[PDB]
Amino acid sequence: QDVVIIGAGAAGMMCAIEAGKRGRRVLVIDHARAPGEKIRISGGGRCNFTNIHASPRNFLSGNPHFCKSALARYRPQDFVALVERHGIGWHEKTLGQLFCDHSAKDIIRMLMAEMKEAGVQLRLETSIGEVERTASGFRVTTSAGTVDAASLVVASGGKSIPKMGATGLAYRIAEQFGLPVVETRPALVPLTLDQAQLAKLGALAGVAADAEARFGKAAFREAVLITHRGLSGPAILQISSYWREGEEIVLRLMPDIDIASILKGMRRANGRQAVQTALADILPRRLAQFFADEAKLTGRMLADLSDKTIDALASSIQVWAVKPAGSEGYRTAEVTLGGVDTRALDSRTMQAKEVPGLYFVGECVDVTGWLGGYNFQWAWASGFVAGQDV
Amino acid sequence: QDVVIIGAGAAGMMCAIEAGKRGRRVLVIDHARAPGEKIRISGGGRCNFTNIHASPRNFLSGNPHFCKSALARYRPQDFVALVERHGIGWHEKTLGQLFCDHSAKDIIRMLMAEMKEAGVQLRLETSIGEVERTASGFRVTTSAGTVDAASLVVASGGKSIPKMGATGLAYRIAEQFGLPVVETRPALVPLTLDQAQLAKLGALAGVAADAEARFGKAAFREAVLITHRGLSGPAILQISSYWREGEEIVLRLMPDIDIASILKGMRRANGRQAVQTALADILPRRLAQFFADEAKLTGRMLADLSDKTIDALASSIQVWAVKPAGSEGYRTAEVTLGGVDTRALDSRTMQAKEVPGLYFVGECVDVTGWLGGYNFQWAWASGFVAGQDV
Numbered sequence: 001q002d003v004v005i006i007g008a009g010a011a012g013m014m015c016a017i018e019a020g021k022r023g024r025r026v027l028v029i030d031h032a033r034a035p036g037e038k039i040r041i042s043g044g045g046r047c048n049f050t051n052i053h054a055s056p057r058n059f060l061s062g063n064p065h066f067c068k069s070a071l072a073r074y075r076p077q078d079f080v081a082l083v084e085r086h087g088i089g090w091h092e093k094t095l096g097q098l099f100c101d102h103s104a105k106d107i108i109r110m111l112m113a114e115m116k117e118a119g120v121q122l123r124l125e126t127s128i129g130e131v132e133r134t135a136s137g138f139r140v141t142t143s144a145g146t147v148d149a150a151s152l153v154v155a156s157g158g159k160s161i162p163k164m165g166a167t168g169l170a171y172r173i174a175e176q177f178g179l180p181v182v183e184t185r186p187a188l189v190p191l192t193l194d195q196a197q198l199a200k201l202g203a204l205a206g207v208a209a210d211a212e213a214r215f216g217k218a219a220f221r222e223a224v225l226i227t228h229r230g231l232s233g234p235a236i237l238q239i240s241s242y243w244r245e246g247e248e249i250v251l252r253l254m255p256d257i258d259i260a261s262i263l264k265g266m267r268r269a270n271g272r273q274a275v276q277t278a279l280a281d282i283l284p285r286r287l288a289q290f291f292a293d294e295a296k297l298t299g300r301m302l303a304d305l306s307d308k309t310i311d312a313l314a315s316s317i318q319v320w321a322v323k324p325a326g327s328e329g330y331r332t333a334e335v336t337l338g339g340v341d342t343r344a345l346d347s348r349t350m351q352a353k354e355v356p357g358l359y360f361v362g363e364c365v366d367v368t369g370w371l372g373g374y375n376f377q378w379a380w381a382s383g384f385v386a387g388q389d390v
Numbered sequence: 391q392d393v394v395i396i397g398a399g400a401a402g403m404m405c406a407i408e409a410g411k412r413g414r415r416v417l418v419i420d421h422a423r424a425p426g427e428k429i430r431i432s433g434g435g436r437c438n439f440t441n442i443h444a445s446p447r448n449f450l451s452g453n454p455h456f457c458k459s460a461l462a463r464y465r466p467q468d469f470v471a472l473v474e475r476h477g478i479g480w481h482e483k484t485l486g487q488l489f490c491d492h493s494a495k496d497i498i499r500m501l502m503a504e505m506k507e508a509g510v511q512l513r514l515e516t517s518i519g520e521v522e523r524t525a526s527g528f529r530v531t532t533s534a535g536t537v538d539a540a541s542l543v544v545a546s547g548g549k550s551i552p553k554m555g556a557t558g559l560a561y562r563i564a565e566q567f568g569l570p571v572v573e574t575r576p577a578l579v580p581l582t583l584d585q586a587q588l589a590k591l592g593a594l595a596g597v598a599a600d601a602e603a604r605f606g607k608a609a610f611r612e613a614v615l616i617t618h619r620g621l622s623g624p625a626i627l628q629i630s631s632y633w634r635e636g637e638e639i640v641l642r643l644m645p646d647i648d649i650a651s652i653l654k655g656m657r658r659a660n661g662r663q664a665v666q667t668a669l670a671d672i673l674p675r676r677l678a679q680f681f682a683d684e685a686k687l688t689g690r691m692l693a694d695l696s697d698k699t700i701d702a703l704a705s706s707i708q709v710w711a712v713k714p715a716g717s718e719g720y721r722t723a724e725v726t727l728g729g730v731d732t733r734a735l736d737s738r739t740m741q742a743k744e745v746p747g748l749y750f751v752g753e754c755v756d757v758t759g760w761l762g763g764y765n766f767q768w769a770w771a772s773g774f775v776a777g778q779d780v
């Protein structure tokens with residue numbers, strides 16, 4: 001072939017299309033029974049396929065400017081234009097998040113059809129054994145035979161959800177060719193609480209609060225879910241990429257309001273209501289009960305509360321420090337932080353600086369998006385950028 | 391005198407200080423028994439004395455660029471520097487809002503002391519009868535006698551809270567000298583609901599929700615209060631300056647979350663809970679009961695709810711259109727929108743373009759700040775700018 005791509009996911013199929021459209025004869029190999037398994041299950045089966053605000057600040061990397069070039073060369077609109085062209089209903093939800101109306105599968109079907117038109121060859125349920133450099137490019141050995149190619153594209157994703165065929169193949173190939181690998185971790189993952197915290201929040205399983213999840217300078221406002229394993233909801237998932245074991249996150253419940261103010265207002269205006277009943281006018285019932293207990297104010301009358309006491313109560317709700325036991329790991333993470341070091345890669349090409357004809361695209365790379373369509377957009381953009389050069 | 395100022399409020403005393411410090415002999419006249427009565431009662435008696443983000447976008451005007459010059463010449467830091475210099479404890483709350491730690495009166499005492507040092511003369515409980523142009527400047531007639539001055543500064547505020555000595559004096563003087571007056575209205579004011587709306591929200595008096603209050607392109611996220619008169623809380627107050635009679639505002643309750651998502655999640659995860667009980671895991675109890683009733687789902691089991699039904703329920707909570715009966719008017723507004731037309735005023739001076747030696751500062755002018763310290767900062771800046779020229 002002129003081009004062999006490992007992994008028929010978001011980045012791989014995009015690259016395929018662009019290289020097939022250039023008349024380049026391309027072959028895509030994947031160990032799965034079906035292409036784009038993550039696409040398929042993503043955005044709750046709807047696929048949050050991009051985000052209108054996609055830009056360098058929405059990604060974590062060791063070199064923050066690395067993604068600048070690809071992102072500008074392939075924008076959310078460009079992908080939207082592609083979807084509309086295939087009659088795929090889409091809409092925005094919150095925070096710039098674009099979803100399909102019908103199902104993630106429309107997108108798979110689409111990429112598929114685009115590949116068929118571009119002349120690319122797809123081989124599924126095919127495992128990779130080795131890759132060797134050759135005087136002429138590369139040879140890859142597979143459970144189905146061997147292929148030679150001038151260009152080889154590593155588009156095999158990251159470590160999240162092993163059950164779906166996630167592997168670290170990309171990292172093994174990077175190291176094999178001497179490319180550094182930025183240390184990887186489960187990201188956009190729920191966070192665990194220890195048996196004691198879980199006992200204390202015993203009765204709050206199922207509550208869902210509007211909240212800021214803060215770690216130092218990073219803050220996200222979205223739902224926080226309390227479960228029997230601990231903390232999830234989009235705000236946890238976001239901050240989970242910034243947090244590290246041993247550390248505290250700070251939760252601001254009902255972040256747009258000032259609870260101390262409210263409570264003093266209710267104090268004059270009514271006065272003779274129980275504390276937990278005043279809180280229940282502000283928070284879901286179970287949370288109200290919880291915060292009134294912890295503070296030892298249950299059944300106490302709102303008018304008997306000093307200012308100092310109210311401030312402390314508010315503070316317990318709006319500056320709530322939690323120290324997570326850990327993360328739930330790769331069986332539950334949406335994304336892998338870290339990956340093939342960017343410094344070793346051509347920003348406008350995706351090609352290994354040290355190894356002509358070798359390319360790394362998509363999530364396997366040390367560019368990691370916030371939750372909200374940013375990861376798919378990076379997959380798109382970098383697949384596209386490689387597809388122009390490959 | 392060299393300079394007579396009408397109104398010993400925020401803008402007037404600031405101007406006084408700056409003109410007194412220049413050796414200009416100044417006199418401040420006020421019909422009140424005490425200076426800075428609004429300062430005194432402002433920020434809940436604490437005084438929200440500025441906002442660190444103060445800038446042109448935080449103000450409504452007929453000429454949006456008018457305030458640019460003054461704001462840059464006198465910044466929140468400049469005022470902070472002044473407070474610290476007088477040993478006045480201050481802190482930030484939310485949204486850039488600076489407050490005193492002790493009381494608004496510290497600030498009054500301070501401005502006072504600064505005036506005494508600057509040599510300015512203060513006359514209180516003194517009413518204004520007329521102002522005439524003179525070959526030499528101005529003559530003002532007062533319940534205490536007459537004064538002549540080369541410069542006359544109108545710093546008499548707006549129409550809000552008549553009980554505290556608010557009057558439209560500024561507007562009467564503008565018109566008398568042919569300066570146009572941008573149409574005035576109660577702003578940062580609660581909004582009223584009609585008897586029918588008030589009956590429907592009968593049982594929600596006292597609830598306080600995190601919410602977005604939206605009118606077209608304007609949106610503010612803060613607390614929304616439901617009372618027996620209707621709607622208040624900072625988010626109402628903010629949007630009230632943008633809204634107009636006959637129109638709708640849209641309320642997004644729990645704006646950082648997607649309730650449709652949450653509810654579908656709770657549907658799989660639990661399933662056999664009553665709708666209103668699922669909502670109570672998200673909203674204060676009374677709101678949960680309200681939204682479940684309106685939608686006619688009370689006691690219904692969360693797993694018997696179609697997607698379409700959930701979407702509609704969510705939408706009722708997060709795209710909630712309300713048509714207000716009116717505003718509560720000037721007895722309750724924090725600020726007056728509109729005022730002396732800016733186009734008629736020197737942006738870098740506050741002087742009437744058509745009338746040498748006549749100046750208009752502070753709230754009487756057609757520059758109106760969002761809630762959060764922006765109005766005091768405009769008072770400061772414009773008082774200061776005038777005080778340099780006067």
Ligand SMILES: Cc1cc2c(cc1C)N(C[C@H](O)[C@H](O)[C@H](O)COP(=O)(O)OP(=O)(O)OC[C@H]1O[C@@H](n3cnc4c(N)ncnc43)[C@H](O)[C@@H]1O)c1[nH]c(=O)[nH]c(=O)c1N2
Binds near residue numbers: 039048158362376
């Ligand atoms: C549940 C869930 C939900 C979402 C998301 C993830 C998850 C887990 N994501 C993240 C998103 O799925 C992710 O960023 C992309 O799929 C990455 O694109 P890639 O092409 O790089 O890898 P990708 O996952 O797409 O594909 C990698 C491919 O290589 C194959 N492969 C792996 N190892 C192999 C091997 N050893 N040999 C051969 N082939 C191998 C795989 O089977 C697979 O098809 C997301 N992102 C987003 O922007 N919006 C969203 O809504 C979501 N939602």
Ligand SMILES: Cc1cc2c(cc1C)N(C[C@H](O)[C@H](O)[C@H](O)COP(=O)(O)OP(=O)(O)OC[C@H]1O[C@@H](n3cnc4c(N)ncnc43)[C@H](O)[C@@H]1O)c1[nH]c(=O)[nH]c(=O)c1N2
Binds near residue numbers: 398419547752
């Ligand atoms: C309850 C409340 C709370 C707040 C606020 C307002 C209110 C009502 N504000 C708004 C703020 O008070 C306002 O913007 C300023 O006081 C305006 O500054 P001025 O100097 O222009 O008028 P200002 O109100 O200060 O003073 C005008 C003066 O002229 C005098 N006067 C009026 N008519 C007269 C007449 N006919 N003859 C002689 N004298 C007359 C008055 O007695 C008064 O002292 C606020 N803003 C903010 O930035 N942060 C905040 O926290 C608050 N909080």
